[PDB]
């Protein structure tokens, strides 16, 4: 709704006896990945993954590289403290994941801030939406909560999400504006897929769209066919666009009573499309 988001996704994985945990970061604006960092690279540095972030100069890259190198060390301490809190052995591999960022509206202002964590694939601790309090998943994460409440660390997180995150996202939208503020509507069609004089699959395609959010559905004279549809989960083309299809087996001869319906932000008007014999 003219609305946008920025998110950083961190994964640290320990590998006991084999040198230090590996730290990986990726950065997204909306559904566009724009930066990465990998502590295992031969010279770890933040690197561009979209063409419009390249216009930031070498000072920007250095600064963020320093951030990531420091975060890596911080996540290693965390991993060490986590293993202790759960009374786990020193030999196993563990995963600490972080996700944080902001949602903003068309006015460019903060709608919601995010900052939360997972240990071994499960919720551990999260900053609540007031950005002034925490939710802890179990008694181990209350140990972390007590530390971070004693230090009032939510104030520093708030400052980042309200003050920094918001202005960086605006900056990136301004750098990337014809790729980030433009929706790419799905190119679409319906293929016929006969299985015999028994059946016929009408698979409906939506290809090449951005952003990823879409709705593909079928009807029988009007009626949604939720039960009798195979839907793939939406998937990357690899060129920064997305694909999806939706299929339905329809009694052989009744195909033209059925209509695929496509909704996506890149189209003024919803599509009601049919098979072309």
């Amino acid at each position: 709704m003219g609305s946008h988001s920025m998110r950083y996704f961190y994964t640290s994985v320990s590998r006991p006896g084999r040198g230090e945990p590996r730290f990986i970061s990726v950065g997204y604006v909306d559904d566009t990945q724009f930066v990465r960092f990998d502590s295992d690279a031969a010279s770890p540095r933040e690197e561009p993954r979209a063409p419009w972030i390249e216009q930031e100069g070498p000072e920007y890259w250095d600064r963020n590289t320093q951030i990531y190198k420091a975060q890596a060390q911080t996540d290693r301490e965390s991993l060490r403290n986590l293993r202790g809190y759960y009374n786990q052995s020193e030999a196993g591999s563990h995963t600490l994941q972080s996700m944080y960022g902001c949602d903003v509206g068309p006015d460019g202002r903060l709608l919601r801030g995010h900052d939360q964590y997972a240990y071994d694939g499960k919720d551990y601790i999260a900053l609540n939406e007031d950005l002034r309090s925490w939710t802890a998943a179990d008694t181990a994460a209350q140990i972390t909560q007590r530390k971070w409440e004693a230090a009032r660390e939510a104030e520093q997180r708030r400052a980042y999400l309200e003050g920094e995150c918001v202005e960086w996202l605006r900056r990136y939208l301004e750098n990337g504006k014809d790729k980030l503020e433009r929706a790419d509507p799905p190119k679409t069609h319906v293929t016929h897929h006969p299985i015999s004089d028994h059946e016929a699959t009408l698979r409906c395609w939506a290809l090449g769209f951005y952003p990823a959010e879409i709705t593909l559905t079928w009807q029988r004279d009007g009626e949604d066919q939720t039960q009798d549809t195979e839907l793939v989960e939406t998937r990357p083309a690899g060129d920064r666009t997305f694909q999806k299809w939706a299929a339905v087996v329809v009694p052989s001869g009744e195909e033209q009573r059925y209509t695929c319906h496509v909704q996506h932000e890149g189209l003024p008007k919803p599509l009601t499309l049919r098979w072309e014999p």
């Binding site: 951030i67 403290n81 601790i125 995150c165």
Partner: peptide, 9 residues
């Protein structure tokens, strides 16, 4: 721009 790291867990 990513956030400056805070205290460990």
């Amino acid at each position: 721009r990513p956030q400056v790291p805070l205290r460990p867990m």
